[PDB]
Amino acid sequence: GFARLKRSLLKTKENLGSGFISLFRGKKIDDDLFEELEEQLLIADVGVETTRKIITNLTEGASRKQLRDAEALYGLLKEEMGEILAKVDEPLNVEGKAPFVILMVGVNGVGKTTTIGKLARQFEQQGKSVMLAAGDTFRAAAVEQLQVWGQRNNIPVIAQHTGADSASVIFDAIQAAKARNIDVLIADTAGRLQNKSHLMEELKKIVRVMKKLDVEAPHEVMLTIDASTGQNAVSQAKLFHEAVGLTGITLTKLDGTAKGGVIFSVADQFGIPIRYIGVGERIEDLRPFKADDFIEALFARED
Numbered sequence: 001g002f003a004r005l006k007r008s009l010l011k012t013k014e015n016l017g018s019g020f021i022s023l024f025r026g027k028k029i030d031d032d033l034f035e036e037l038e039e040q041l042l043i044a045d046v047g048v049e050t051t052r053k054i055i056t057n058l059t060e061g062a063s064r065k066q067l068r069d070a071e072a073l074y075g076l077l078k079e080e081m082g083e084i085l086a087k088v089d090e091p092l093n094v095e096g097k098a099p100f101v102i103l104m105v106g107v108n109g110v111g112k113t114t115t116i117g118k119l120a121r122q123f124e125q126q127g128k129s130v131m132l133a134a135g136d137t138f139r140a141a142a143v144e145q146l147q148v149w150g151q152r153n154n155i156p157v158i159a160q161h162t163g164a165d166s167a168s169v170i171f172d173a174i175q176a177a178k179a180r181n182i183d184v185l186i187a188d189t190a191g192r193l194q195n196k197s198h199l200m201e202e203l204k205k206i207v208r209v210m211k212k213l214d215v216e217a218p219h220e221v222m223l224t225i226d227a228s229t230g231q232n233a234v235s236q237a238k239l240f241h242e243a244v245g246l247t248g249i250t251l252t253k254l255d256g257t258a259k260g261g262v263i264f265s266v267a268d269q270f271g272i273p274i275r276y277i278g279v280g281e282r283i284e285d286l287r288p289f290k291a292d293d294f295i296e297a298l299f300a301r302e303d
């Protein structure tokens with residue numbers, strides 16, 4: 001089973017899941033084993049704190065059951081790491097709002113704009129009308145690229161002149177979405193980390209201004225982070241979550257990176273639903289995150 005996701009996770013499986021099998025083969029459970037496993041979890045970008053929790057719980061579980069052979073730790077690890085991901089398995093539901101507003105936050109270069117387009121096309125295939133807001137207002141090339149994409153896909157894009165107030169652009173986009181019976185409004189935002197506190201104030205202003213039109217907006221504050229950036233994804237998530245409060249995460253570029261284990265650090269550190277994982281270039285390769293599929297793909301040795 002899960003042959004496709006196993007292929008997407010091939011490089012990550014070298015260290016996690018089925019990658020554990022060679023580590024445990026023929027070994028006893030002792031402090032040396034747990035030191036080796038800790039090292040491998042850290043190399044896989046699971047993170048110092050999440051790795052410490054896993055090791056602590058495995059040690060107690062192995063001792064409680066008086067396990068002898070390292071091979072038995074495999075199933076315990078599958079349970080511990082599977083529970084981490086199951087706690088953030090909650091798909092995004094965009095139904096029933098006029099419009100449902102998604103505020104897309106994150107730094108530049110991690111897949112935010114790509115994810116906006118994939119989400120927009122997915123919602124359209126579901127029968128929904130979509131509109132985009134070009135709220136990254138000081139990056140003229142990025143605004144223009146979003147407008148070009150919208151024109152190519154017959155999806156309206158609300159934009160103002162270079163340097164416009166992002167909260168004003170997004171307010172106008174909500175007004176336009178309401179006026180034109182739009183089902184989903186996806187708002188792009190700036191992603192410059194230079195002087196990060198200014199960006200966070202910009203995002204908080206966007207959120208405050210939305211409430212004049214709909215106290216429920218934004219219905220989703222979605223972070224986009226890039227698994228190939230390792231623990232940078234975790235520090236980005238902490239920055240945005242402490243600043244504005246996330247309600248969902250998209251983790252991109254899981255295909256081909258050996259750093260996919262960062263998903264456990266993101267899940268455990270914040271407890272925010274992971275809505276989507278990116279595993280390729282097609283629209284359909286932005287996949288709703290399913291924790292069981294993910295853990296089975298990672299830990300299975302068959303194909």
Ligand SMILES: Nc1nc2c(ncn2[C@@H]2O[C@H](COP(=O)(O)OP(=O)(O)NP(=O)(O)O)[C@@H](O)[C@H]2O)c(=O)[nH]1
Nearest residue numbers: 107108109110111112113114115252253278279280
């Ligand atoms: N291999 C892979 N690449 C992805 C995935 N999602 C996004 N990307 C790629 O990552 C790059 C960054 O995409 P983009 O959306 O342009 O990034 P951004 O966060 O808006 N800012 P910038 O314009 O600097 O890129 C693009 O080349 C994109 O095609 C994914 O899921 N897998």
Ligand SMILES: [N+]
Nearest residue numbers: 047048049050
């Ligand atoms: N950590």
Ligand SMILES: [N+]
Nearest residue numbers: 092093094095
């Ligand atoms: N939905």
Ligand SMILES: [N+]
Nearest residue numbers: 138162163164
């Ligand atoms: N300017």
Ligand SMILES: [N+]
Nearest residue numbers: 204205208209
């Ligand atoms: N405001």
Ligand SMILES: [N+]
Nearest residue numbers: 007010011256
């Ligand atoms: N691959």
